[PDB]
């Protein structure tokens, strides 16, 4: 499954949940978008702005469900 959206061209006028926020799909501090490379799912960490304020991109990161394997 490549990162490209075969169902979304990421138009500037329209926001895509796969390339943006799935929970709200809105523009909010997009630079702080966190996503698990194994999945195209991200976290409301930028929308909610929780104490985490940390980016695990330093190394490969897996979403909580990935580990629930």
């Amino acid at each position: 499954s490549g990162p490209s959206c075969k169902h979304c061209k990421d138009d500037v006028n329209r926001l895509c949940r796969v390339c943006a926020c799935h929970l709200c799909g809105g523009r909010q501090d997009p630079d702080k978008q966190l996503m698990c490379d194994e999945c195209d799912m991200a976290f409301h960490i930028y929308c909610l702005d929780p104490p985490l304020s940390s980016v695990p991109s330093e190394d490969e990161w897996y979403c909580p469900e990935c580990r629930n394997d």
Partner: peptide, 12 residues
């Protein structure tokens, strides 16, 4: 990992 900053995109 896959940070994917996501370029700015809105109805703006």
């Amino acid at each position: 990992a896959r940070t994917k900053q996501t370029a700015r995109k809105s109805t703006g």
